Design a binder for this molecule. Structure first.
Ligand code: NAD
Ligand code: NAD
Ligand code: NAD
Ligand code: NAD
Ligand code: CA
Ligand code: CA
Ligand code: CA
Ligand code: CA
Ligand code: K
Ligand code: K
Ligand code: K
Ligand code: K
Ligand code: K
Ligand code: K
Ligand code: ZN
Ligand code: ZN
Ligand code: ZN
Ligand code: ZN
Lengths: 548, 375, 375, 548
């Protein structure tokens, strides 16, 4: 762009100069030597001289003619044998060499940059989040204060990289944080708090902070973070619900204090092997299966779908409906013993979850935790022989192998399954390239940090236009009033009246559900609506519909 | 600079032109009995060297052929070989040694005068530079570290010299004798070495920033004209702000500043508590409650509740900001005095809920500022 | 490779030549009633584009002038612009991306077959390469470390690929399915990961060098076709040489080899003493006399006098050589069995006074050698 | 060289091609068009075509003539517009860019390399040794196995740098160690032993090893080292002789078991302030002052020379003559107390020397020595306040400030002199750039590691042709027999008869001495000769002279 314009601007200067010299030529040939030449001849002569061809078939004879001829001759050499290669090599090659042998850090962002997503702090989580939304061509800009990292990130793109201090208000100004679509804060908790307070001093751009410690979640929202995601707490929890011999209800949300969302692993449950409509969950519980999660895919629950030992049911309903489901499972086995290998922030949260039930566990680690003081840990290297044995791995019922190193996880899953083919093995994969090999080692289930983290962050980014909306709001369930038995969503006009929105429409005697129904959906009789709105519109709901 | 070699070549070319134009007329006359003008000789010579070659004026003798061949070869060598060979080996060569492979400045120009030498760059001296740009001094920072020299070279408001600060030959190339003033911001043993070395050459005014107030006397002995104990000053500020019976002040951070704060609150005297994750390697006169403050219980354990004031003094601004948030979140009214290492974090410490913020960069640069003006 | 783009251009140029030579004759005829030969058209066209410009054959019409101008401009663009622009941006450009800034090979050519993948380069596998060069295999070493890739690139007898050994997409680009054999010389957890990943793609024979004999069974489970416990073997060798009552053997070095030596001398059984500067991070079944052996008294303290044999087993050949000298200098006849990490130090261990020398590189490469031949 | 030859070989190809085309031109012009042109015309035409000038005044008219003309035209462009710039840029610029932006390690040395000095292991010692003999233009080649060090050393030269494993026999082969003049082994003791044993497997080139531990001196000579230099032991010793309040005799050599060399510091001695001939040392001792060392200069002792508080007398004589001198000093002060700051290998040797007298000392250090177990050390940081005070620095009589850090040394010398203007301060300078500032701090004497080490190594390199000669030999002293009273050294023929050599000739009643007298020196009556020879020629000395 910038260089091309200067390139053909030079072509316009030459073409003008050509016509100039061609005209002066015809002029002088007439007024000095009494020769009349055509316009074409003038162009023909001028080109002949500049290109240094020099046929000599049209030449001057006077000194003044020699003078003009010499000038046109030098002009050609200067502007076709000197400037043209030099001008080329300086405007073209200087960028091409300097920028390719010598990393020039992107210190700023173009002023016209709008609707971009600022990523702070790169890791397998955000690394995956980028790659999964780069398939979507989202304008991603990751920032870092590490020189040796910026150029590394420049090689696999992907994305754009800005090198500067994430907390610096001036660096943020050059990042155009005001025009930003969203901001992912994945630095340490003290750094994130610094980032949020600084961003808030410039704009109100929505920030998603990935809090390094569940306690610091409150402090980050105070800093200005519109959303807070405790990964390890969630990741550890996901390691835990899978670790038990028989699956149990896992409470997710208790909004509105009457409607709850809860997930349930199907492994070890009576629902394992049967289909959804066969087990009759909604039938005996009154719940709403709002999705079946299996192998990284949230699918619409159908009666044909066969629940496997690796499934996960997303459920919604009242408080007495969840307790009705826990009754059907219904009891947990006795004398469970869960070995948790690795005592980091994830391994800790894994035990923390298993303690909220509670279930007797054992922690094994190489060193003393610098953060936790509430858990008892058996100190020892899980690789060195007899270390697991002496800890009493024999009477264990399940093992959570959660180490910061994947090859070690794979090696422990490999060894444990080799010694105890019976016990349940849950493995943790830091990188998603190691997930398959963990299953191949003998693990019954694998929790991938990167993928799980990317899904959460991603969904919070896609549903962003309704994220801070749905935040501070309460989801609710209303049985379709017999008045609208046969009316269309667009015809009913629910939103302009009440203010809420239809997120789900399920049939009377069916586990089948219609997630996010289009306005042209024709409602039926006995259907059960699941809506989302403010804790003010939920009360002005039954008010508005009955009073029109 | 490269101009002088280039237009000298143009001078030689111009001479070679007139020389060839002259011989042309002389030869044309004596060789073949032809009388050509001066412009004809210029026009002919140009036509030959530029290799245009109109052929309208050509010799017919062997002596004329030889000459023509000589002028032709000259046009090739001195326009199609040397002229481009010059180009690349005159200012495309310094282009690689200064833009493709970082070339550190190891010495200043001989005539350099009225410049300010900065030894040991930090947020304080970095701010001292951008605070005196309106006076338009020439700030030169000197570092014995290669990597630091490179980072300080891409961003600029000052000059960057790479070499041993404590070397006499390096100080000589820095033209210290012609310097306006020198700022010593290295460690105490280094500054002592820096002064004694400078004093062997010149008597340039030295403003040394001392690490321990006790060492201040020694730095004067070395040769410093002024000594600035900032952490005593910065520590004194934090202590003054924390106060202006049951009055308990928490000092979170037991470094040289935090220590100076505690040392100040002994003169009042006001009871205090020092919390740190590590035992001070320089101090053994204060009592420190050990344990990391970010973890959690330590603030509640030591009793942040019955405290009247809090002083957050960590070398990490992000940590400070985080602690200021936590304290303000726990006790919504307690006096919180925070420390700012960089001036970029001052606004966020107040946003976090601090009642007063002391900036090391601001206070530091202001003192060093008012010492370079009232020299 | 760049040839094909270059001579295609020569083909285009040749076509453009004949095209211009043809139009020339056609125009000369129809425009000005002149009949020129084919060679005249070639000769004229060349003369114009090369900008020689004899002017002996020139048009006199405007249509002829236009054409001449077009052929002239073409000679400039397609010989003085594109021809050099091609040059620089065709094989002077790969010259910078491969000789001025190290470009690591991240993938092998699609057709690559019969190659041997080496995972984890060391004096053993480095010797395995230079020991099978007469068979002319294609050895490719793979390292996830940038710096190591660069050092292994300047010196060569093998191919160097940079990337994560435990990545499926990286193994796919290494064409493991077409590989002759794979050598796993990484840590035990890594090899387990390496095998399980390879087995998901292909069933290429894997020769895994296991770190702990107990883990050998696990590596077979992972997918290895052969497992080689060298330190057990190397330790066994040292023990066999140390012997073939009051017989005391000193083992200087308590690593996995030294441990294996001690583990072997328990089966005999022959009393021994293990001397090391550090407690073994993997072993807790042997008794080690702690203290550095180079310092001095430790050899005299433990009683190197009443010993019958000495086994020097340190991961440092220079240390070994030095200890072998010291022992031979103290006791001029005592049995000294030394360990050689590299094969370059074997001769100096004997020169130092060793009675027999076991070379890790030699023994290692020979086993791995006879496993790739009798596949 | 290599590139220049290819350059003007191309000029010879062109000149031949010019003459070729010029000849074929005249040939064709005759046989094809009946035109006769001169030799000059042919050159004139051919040049005109190749250079693309193209006057057109001499042109062909036939097709065959057009064919030849076109060939010469293309030939010119290929060989003056294509090959000439390309050939240039590939033979010239490729070395100039690649070798200047990308370090190409010198892996080998040219076969014809003879009489070079191989330096192994670079440090302030060898760094100085190089710079001091690079003023002498000695062919120095330093070797290293550190990639990030080889290119650093390439920037300040000085010297040439070979990058390879010093112990590798193949790397040594490429270094041409056989043709080497000498080898300086300055690696660790285990590495040096490896180096020597390897070099000895190839050649018998003299090796000077710098042993890191005085005990390992025996083991290195066994490895093949022709010479062994314990620097710290020597450096520590030099710190010690200067530390005492009053100087004392320091025994250097006891060769032949009757002649000894010994040095003596003049500080605190009665000789301080007076001249050599005034104190009358040779007079009252019978010794031979073979040199006066002051301020880095070994000068010939003259009666005019004034001994200062910083002088050092190099002496030679029998065993009873040295004891006669210690009598003249003659006694040491009482209750001396020497504080030695820093307990490394040098600080250790300093105490080791002070214990061989003995003199009560105190050691202070930050940490426990990993090598020594014989000395008691007061653990503490000498920078932190009251640390020296509590150790009892008050009743000390002298301080040896010997730290690995010069700025610290300077800062301690500065502080100690400020608190105790009376006590003697000996300081250690790792780098010679810090020597002057140590004196400026208040030190009474400074021992520079680099300079002292360079002098020893240097003298062992210059006197190399007589180093291994004088090694294993015994220096002796013989009173000039009255028979040669008036005869010249060359006339006497001492060497061809006995086998020894005259190294010194001193006068009867004079402290003046003639070091290394020229053969034309006319001997006198009563002169005292100091010779050097084998322990076999010293006995065949008095035998040969008396029996002719
Ligand atoms: N709290 C959150 O929800 C959240 C959110 C976003 C990011 N993060 C960040 O993600 C990080 C993830 O936590 P993590 O990766 O540090 O936890 P981690 O479990 O990976 O920590 C590793 C632990 O495993 C142990 N270990 C390693 N090898 C072992 C072996 N062979 N035998 C026994 N033990 C072994 C070590 O002792 C160590 O304690 C957190 O540190 C946090 O900063 C956290
Ligand atoms: N003589 C003077 O007045 C003067 C003047 C200018 C400069 N200086 C120099 O400036 C330097 C700056 O001092 P400084 O910045 O290192 O002092 P500092 O107070 O910042 O020291 C840092 C301390 O904070 C603590 N810390 C860090 N993170 C913590 C956490 N999460 N929880 C609890 N504690 C934590 C550490 O234990 C550490 O001791 C000084 O070393 C001094 O030499 C001195
Ligand atoms: N299962 C197998 O048989 C097998 C096969 C091939 C490879 N391997 C692997 O090869 C690796 C190589 O083992 P290694 O070379 O580390 O064993 P090692 O014997 O060389 O271990 C080194 C030890 O020598 C000691 N040491 C070093 N300097 C000393 C000194 N100056 N004085 C006294 N002691 C000193 C250290 O304490 C250290 O423990 C092993 O880790 C192993 O995993 C194993
Ligand atoms: N033995 C020989 O003669 C010889 C010959 C050639 C080379 N060398 C090598 O030269 C090296 C020189 O020895 P060195 O430099 O390691 O000895 P060193 O005296 O420099 O070691 C430094 C010591 O000073 C102490 N120290 C540092 N700061 C201090 C402070 N503020 N207060 C108190 N103590 C402080 C440290 O504890 C440390 O022990 C040797 O290690 C050896 O390898 C030796
Ligand atoms: Ca894998
Ligand atoms: Ca900030
Ligand atoms: Ca060797
Ligand atoms: Ca100095
Ligand atoms: K031309
Ligand atoms: K003509
Ligand atoms: K004509
Ligand atoms: K021409
Ligand atoms: K021409
Ligand atoms: K012409
Ligand atoms: Zn815990
Ligand atoms: Zn303190
Ligand atoms: Zn063992
Ligand atoms: Zn000692």
């Amino acid at each position: 762009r910038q260089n091309l314009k200067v390139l053909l601007l030079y072509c316009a200067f030459l073409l003008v100069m050509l016509l100039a010299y061609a005209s002066i030529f015809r002029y002088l040939m007439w007024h000095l030597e009494g020769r009349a030449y055509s316009f074409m001849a003038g162009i023909y002569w001028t080109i002949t001289v500049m290109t240094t061809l020099g046929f000599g078939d049209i030449t001057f004879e006077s000194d003044a003619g020699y003078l003009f001829a010499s000038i046109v001759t030098v002009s050609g050499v200067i502007f076709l044998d000197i400037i043209l290669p030099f001008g080329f090599v300086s405007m073209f090659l200087a960028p091409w060499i300097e920028r390719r042998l010598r990393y020039h850090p992107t210190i700023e962002l173009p002023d016209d940059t709008r609707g971009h997503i600022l990523i702070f702090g790169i890791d397998p989580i955000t690394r995956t989040l980028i790659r999964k939304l780069e398939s979507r061509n989202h304008l991603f800009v990751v920032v870092t204060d590490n020189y040796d990292q910026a150029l590394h990130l420049e090689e696999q793109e992907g994305f754009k990289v800005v090198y500067g201090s994430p907390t610096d208000a001036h660096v943020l100004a050059g990042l155009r944080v005001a025009a930003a679509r969203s901001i992912i804060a994945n630095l340490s908790d003290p750094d994130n708090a610094n980032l949020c307070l600084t961003v808030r001093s410039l704009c109100q751009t929505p920030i998603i902070a990935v809090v390094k410690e569940p306690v610091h979640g409150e402090l980050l929202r105070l800093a200005g973070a519109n959303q807070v995601v405790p990964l390890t707490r969630i990741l550890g929890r996901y390691l835990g619900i899978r670790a038990t011999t028989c699956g149990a209800l896992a409470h997710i949300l208790d909004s509105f204090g009457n409607l709850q969302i809860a997930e349930l692993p199907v492994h070890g449950t009576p629902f394992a092997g049967k289909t959804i409509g066969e087990s009759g969950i909604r039938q005996r519980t009154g719940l709403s299966i709002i999705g079946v999660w299996e192998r990284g895919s949230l699918t619409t629950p159908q009666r044909e779908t066969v629940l496997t030992e690796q499934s996960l049911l997303v459920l919604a309903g009242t408080k007495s409906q969840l307790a009705a489901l826990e009754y059907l499972i219904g009891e947990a086995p006795e004398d469970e013993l869960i070995f948790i290998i690795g005592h980091g922030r994830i391994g800790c949260a894994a035990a923390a979850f298993l303690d909220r039930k509670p279930v007797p566990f054992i922690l094994i680690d190489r060193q003393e935790s610098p953060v936790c003081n509430d858990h008892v840990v058996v100190y020892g290297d899980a690789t060195v022989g007899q270390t697991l044995r002496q800890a009493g791995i024999d009477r264990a019922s399940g093992i959570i192998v959660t180490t910061n190193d994947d090859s070690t996880n794979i090696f422990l899953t490999l060894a444990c399954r080799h010694l105890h083919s019976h016990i349940r093995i849950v493995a943790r994969a830091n990188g998603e390239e190691n997930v398959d090999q963990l299953y191949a080692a003998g693990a019954d289930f694998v929790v991938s940090n990167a993928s799980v983290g990317a899904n959460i962050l991603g969904n919070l980014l896609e549903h962003k236009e309704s994220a801070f909306l749905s935040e501070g709001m309460a989801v609710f369930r209303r049985p379709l009033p017999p008045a609208m038995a046969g009316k269309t969503i667009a015809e009913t006009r629910l939103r302009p009246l009440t203010g809420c929105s239809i997120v789900a429409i399920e049939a009377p005697d069916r586990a089948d559900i219609l997630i996010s129904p289009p306005p042209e959906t024709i409602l039926a009789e006995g259907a059960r609506l699941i809506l989302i709105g403010t804790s003010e519109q939920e009360k002005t709901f039954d008010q508005t519909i009955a009073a029109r």
